[PDB]
């Protein structure tokens, strides 16, 4: 397939995994439904996991900067790809929060009124997390840097191990049931401290959406003195990075490149 | 197979997902079982699966008027049998609801007895969507109308990207678990929106039968202005059509016919 | 293999459903464990699944009475292996039962004391109902027995579409995920009504041991002027026969004999 | 694979799946995530399935030191390699109990704060049940050992069910999805009883990690006169060696030594 067409299809699935996952947070949120965290992480896994179905023939389902960076320096992935892979995946996971919004629209300016919730605020970022992740109130920049490091770098891990070239998950049913099942036990262990969010596209974003619908800027910071937006960013970056450094050295599979 | 086998598996197979899907509604309603969001889709995303097994290796397996319509438009499916799966799919559909119906009736009245509801009359309306589906109320026609297209043009990609023929879903377990995951997370994403419909037959057949069952004229209007089952009636269509004919276009793969 | 191989591995099949399903019944009951009815439902598909898997390639993983039956009648089992293999299953889930009752013994006393319930009473049958299914107390011996037959059908027209030969379910994995998953679906919409028995060993094996444990004739009768265990030894061979006769109408599929 | 490769192995493995258990646990305790018992017992596992499936082919994917034992003893599994898989899979438990502890540092101290827990006291036994399993209230220690004896039994006959060779399980995604429902419905059962714990170094390794923390001597005995700790620490090393002996008498299933 050419770029145009692979550039499409990372779009596409980076946008699908995104309405799944963060219309089931806004229906947890505002519109009452009842859902456990176990619930929540299953859907984003099952989500993530359909997303890899429908797209690992065209663009090697990578769905995540933070995967794509990996494979181009660990494995036989391009490097005149890598900036069009992260620029499709930011604009599907703006573009589906965007329609998730519109679809909850009412919904939303409910919650807002019942409560006296003005957007923009401190007490808006609870609201806010519908959309992106923020940290657990306990836990403290450096902290919520290390979960995600390590939660990303167990996930390129088996990404590793399940691909056939240096390019991205192959096809099949099995390897997009097998990170599904990975990102919902993670999500359930980890989850409630930095939102398991493991994807710089999946927080960026829909946090610069936020930022759009009203938000403004706590959107970003989250109400921290230290931007929080900077621990989904580069957290699975290196995560990610130190987790295929492992996997290079204590295992060493050959690849075609 | 003939039509007429053709036509008992599809008002089986309708008649098998309502049987389950309508029951567990049931039951969290009146028999006080305690369901979640995401438990209630998952049940009707594996009654789909078990019925879609169960009748693909004869019909095809649509059970959907909406993919019905797609697959003749965008697929190889002969235009003669179109009336005769809608048909069958409807009747099955409404058969099922009668008869859990049937079996819950007992619980059906003391529900009314307790709470002093009449049936027919706008509070009625709640125990009404036991059998079929209607808005969050904070949500409009047109937001209504918007969430069934989206949600069907999703499985309708799903479905023609699962197809060798372009008949219908083919025969093995890959297909139907496939369609069944992906129903279970529209309906915990959007399912609290309305109800997760995605099948005009899965709601006219029931909304007919809640009609004669006492309800009256609130089983099609929903008690809004504007009739609300006109929604899941052509949302659903309009959706599918819509990502059949994307799929032919960002992809455009080849058919027999 | 030999009679004798195949009746041990029913025997231990049996007990190994009943050990699941009742034992996760009674962490809900007298352990205080929270388990929504999709949880008790997807414990006992996935039990009965995890047993068929382990029985299938020896005795061909009936662990059915009605099962059992109707595939003498309409397949290829021999008439000379229905009586034991009965046998073997019901005092499979009768020894079962004792042994979930033991690991539980000292939580089950605990929770008559501080109830104050008298074993043997009309209130001790809500305790009775961790070993064996009662019915809701607004449907009648008609109405359940009804419940049974069309559950206990569906059941049967899935494992006729499964098997090969016409002696039980195929080895392989496939096979015993469908079952399971289908008692899933079955128990989550219509388990609340009469709890999803569909096997007469799973319902009079545990009531023999009831009686035993010293509940006495509350436990075959439920408190009730007809006595309720005729409905989990009956309606389930009936719905299963009226269920592979309807199989073999619509389909007839060829069998070695 | 050399032996140092293989106990890299084992120890990356019994620290994934404690790391993804502890983890979700800790959530449920300290982070007031919503978790029920099939939750829970779901959770683990899938993360020793995942586990599984990422040291099968290197180190056979033990993960165990009761089935390393039952695989020496009746299986072809090389006594040579018994004493380093057991310390490997020892210490991987206890390191990755340290990790699952320094993430949830902050909320762990913010527990006791509010509830005014003194680690170290008898009321510092729940807290401790975060990292290693405890007994119910009201059962005793025969009654404790008894539960880990037969869950152990049951999960021995799988595996010996599954292997091809005597070494362990083998490659692919059947075998270890199989053991990770198994261990789910355990836990669903029994689990209420005594924390499911079914591996020596699942619960030892944890427990000395919780006596360093400052728990001290309570995270041994749990508060009763006799200590807890010698269950989880032969119960299961008991009942694998007793369902090991049923497997190779009822079947007796030929191996290559």
């Given at each position: 397939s050419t770029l145009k067409g692979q550039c499409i299809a990372e779009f596409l699935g980076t946008g699908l995994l995104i309405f799944f996952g963060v219309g089931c947070v806004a229906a947890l949120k505002v519109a009452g439904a009842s859902f456990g965290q176990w619930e929540i992480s299953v859907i984003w896994g099952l989500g993530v996991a359909m997303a890899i179905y429908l797209t690992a023939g065209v663009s090697?389902?990578?769905?995540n900067p933070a995967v794509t960076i990996a494979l181009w320096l660990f494995a036989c992935?391009?490097?005149?790809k890598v900036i069009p892979f992260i620029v499709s995946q930011v604009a599907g996971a703006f573009c589906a929060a965007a329609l998730v919004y519109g679809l909850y629209y009412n919904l939303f300016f409910d919650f807002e009124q019942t409560h006296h919730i003005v957007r923009g605020?401190?007490?808006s970022v609870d609201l806010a997390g519908t959309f992106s992740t923020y940290p657990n109130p306990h836990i403290n920049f450096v902290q919520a840097f290390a979960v995600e490091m390590v939660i990303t770098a167990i996930l390129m891990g088996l990404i590793l191990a399940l691909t056939?070239?240096?390019?991205?998950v192959p096809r099949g049913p099995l390897a997009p049931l097998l990170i599904g099942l990975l990102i919902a036990v993670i999500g359930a262990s980890m989850?409630?401290?930095?939102?398991?969010?493991?994807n710089p596209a999946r927080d960026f974003g829909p946090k610069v959406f936020a930022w759009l619908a009203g938000w403004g800027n706590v959107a970003f910071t989250?109400?921290?003195?230290?931007?929080?937006?900077?621990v989904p960013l580069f957290g699975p970056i290196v995560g990610a990075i130190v987790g295929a450094f492992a996997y290079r050295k204590l295992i060493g599979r050959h690849l075609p490149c």
């Open positions: 090697g389902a990578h769905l992935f391009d490097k005149r605020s401190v007490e056939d070239d240096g390019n991205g989850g409630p401290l930095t939102g398991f969010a493991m989250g109400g921290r003195d230290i931007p929080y937006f900077l």
